[PDB]
């Protein structure tokens, strides 16, 4: 199943330290590392470092700035990374990945995208998007939602709590003066909706907020 | 059931048991160490076999002290785990022919 | 370290065409390499280890091969679930290190974009100001341009656009323009346009709507 489990988003104020933690089910051998890949946006996968829990012992990224420490938990199987004292080039989504000690990542986790600004959270506010009072459809029917005024990256956007991807064009986010903005599209056939339903779960791994609401058309 | 016999059969035991721990301290050991080739489980084990029975091919050779105590631990459990076996064998022919004989 | 270098970092094949990626290691390794894939805001997906070997769950699509310095990650057959970018990460000298990438386009047929335009809801101007959207779906080549004019009389302010990778559903590409007015100025108007003008089409292809 899902066996790696990585923390959506974490916002640290540019100085402090942050402790990032990955956690395993599946099998737990002792010949595990776990291994962790910083992913700056823009940029490629860069390996920070890797560590064996069945005994504890680290290595780090020599060759890349040495800031962090890696650390293990006896039973949970769960590990730690302890990025501390950044500028606001240490902003990257940050995965852990299991080795087996044959050399590749076998499986990794979902990533912890984190922000490093002086700023403080600000959870999002959704607003849907049904066809103009009196516009004219085809045989596919396109809706969408806007989510705005957010921070920080990223937000979890869904379509019928997760079961629909049919259409679904979501939208990279943009920059409005220290909050965010950006839409969700999907397209299902006008068949369907408004003869049947449509809401959309957003979730935003920071302030953590569920926020749901259907879609209904416009008088 | 004897001694050398009964002392073969424990070398043989704690051969084994020291090329895998070998493997995993050695991989344990050179992980860390820019330009360390000795540093996934599967290979330190062939290297093990390839270290301990003294053959050293060469290609996988450790590259940090402690890797090379670990080295020096497989070395030296090889020979003695050979050596000893080889007691056992000559101690056998040499009862074999106190028999052929009488003494 | 072992430096892998991947040529070149964009890759365009048409679909149902064989496209093969390249990574070249910095000093003979022997078979110590391993492919990863990863699309847009995923994690990267195992593809194939020690060059040349299978993974469960990856098709017969992705083959792999090469050995010393020299490796290749070849398909057969690219379809548009395969836009992602490609990435190479060796495991026979400490430390590990990854490639550079190299992301995989597809040129597909010509395709003009879904137009649509949407007013603001009964919770956005409830809750204070409002917005107005106009998407740009599933057209294809990822040249257009995004046109607001209120009245007649062209608004260039509090545009912002945004732009969609190359969908890996159908090989497309997608669009949003976010215009966003508090009612102050929204009340006192009543016309919001949005065109676009794409290579198939010489005429713009419009939407609008009216605040009644
Ligand atoms: C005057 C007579 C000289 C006789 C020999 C003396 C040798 C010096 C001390 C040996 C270790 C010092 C470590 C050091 O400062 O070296 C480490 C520095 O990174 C790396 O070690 C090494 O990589 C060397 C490992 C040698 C292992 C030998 C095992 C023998 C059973
Ligand atoms: C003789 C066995 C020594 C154990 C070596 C442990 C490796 C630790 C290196 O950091
Ligand atoms: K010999
Ligand atoms: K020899
Ligand atoms: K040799
Ligand atoms: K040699
Ligand atoms: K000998």
């Not at chain 1, 806007?146 to 943009?174: C, D, I, M, Q, R």
């Not at chain 2, 051969?15 to 489980?41: D, K, N």
Request: aromatic share 10%; glycine share 8%.
């Amino acid at each position: 199943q899902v066996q790696l489990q990585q923390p959506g988003a974490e916002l640290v104020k540019p100085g402090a330290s942050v402790k990032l933690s990955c956690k395993a089910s599946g099998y737990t051998f002792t010949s595990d590392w776990i291994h962790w890949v910083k992913q700056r946006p823009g940029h490629g996968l860069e390996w920070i470092g890797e560590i064996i829990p069945s005994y504890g012992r680290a290595n780090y990224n020599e060759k890349i700035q040495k800031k962090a420490t890696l650390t293990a938990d006896k039973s949970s199987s769960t590990a730690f990374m302890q990025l501390s004292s950044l500028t606001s080039e240490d902003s990257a989504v940050y995965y852990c990945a299991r080795e087996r000690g044959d050399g590749y990542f076998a499986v990794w986790g979902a990533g912890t995208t984190v922000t490093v600004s002086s700023a403080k959270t600000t959870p999002p506010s959704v607003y849907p998007l049904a066809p103009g009072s009196a516009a004219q459809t085809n045989s596919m029917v396109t809706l969408g939602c806007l989510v705005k005024g957010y921070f920080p990256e990223p937000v979890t956007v869904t379509w019928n709590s997760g079961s629909l991807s049919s259409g679904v064009h979501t939208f990279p986010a943009v920059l409005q003066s220290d909050l965010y903005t950006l839409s969700s599209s999907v397209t299902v056939p006008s068949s369907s909706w408004p003869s049947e339903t449509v809401t959309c779960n957003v979730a935003h791994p920071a302030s953590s907020t569920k926020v749901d609401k259907k879609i209904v058309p416009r008088d | 059931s004897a001694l050398h016999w009964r002392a073969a059969g424990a070398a043989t035991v704690l051969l084994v048991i020291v090329l895998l721990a070998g493997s995993y301290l050695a991989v344990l050991a050179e992980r860390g160490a820019p330009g360390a080739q000795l540093i996934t489980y599967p290979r330190a084990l062939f290297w093990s076999v390839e270290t301990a029975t003294t053959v050293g091919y060469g290609d996988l050779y450790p590259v940090t002290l402690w890797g090379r105590c670990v080295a020096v631990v497989v070395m030296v459990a090889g020979i003695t785990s050979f050596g000893l076996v080889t007691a056992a064998l000559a101690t056998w022919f040499v009862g074999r022919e106190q028999e052929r004989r009488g003494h | 370290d072992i430096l892998l270098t991947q040529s070149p970092a964009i890759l365009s094949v048409s679909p149902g065409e064989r496209v093969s990626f390249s990574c070249r290691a910095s000093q003979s390794i022997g078979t110590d390499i391993h492919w990863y894939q990863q699309r847009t805001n995923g994690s990267p997906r195992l593809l194939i280890k020690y060059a040349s070997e299978s993974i469960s769950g990856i098709p017969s699509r992705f083959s792999g091969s090469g050995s010393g310095t020299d490796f290749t990650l070849s398909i057969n057959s690219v379809e548009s679930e395969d836009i992602a970018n490609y990435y190479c990460q060796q495991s026979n000298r400490w430390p590990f290190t990854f490639g550079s990438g190299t992301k995989l386009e597809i040129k597909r047929a010509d395709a003009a974009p879904t137009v649509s335009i949407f007013p603001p809801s009964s919770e956005q101007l409830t809750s204070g100001g409002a917005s107005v959207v106009c998407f740009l779906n599933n057209f294809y080549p990822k040249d257009i341009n995004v046109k607001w004019k209120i009245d007649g009389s062209e608004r260039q302010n509090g545009v912002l656009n945004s732009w969609t990778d190359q969908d890996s559903k159908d090989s497309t590409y997608s669009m949003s323009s976010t215009l966003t007015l508090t009612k102050d100025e929204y009340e006192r108007h009543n016309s919001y346009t949005c065109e676009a003008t794409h290579k198939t089409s010489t005429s713009p292809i419009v939407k609008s709507f009216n605040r009644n």
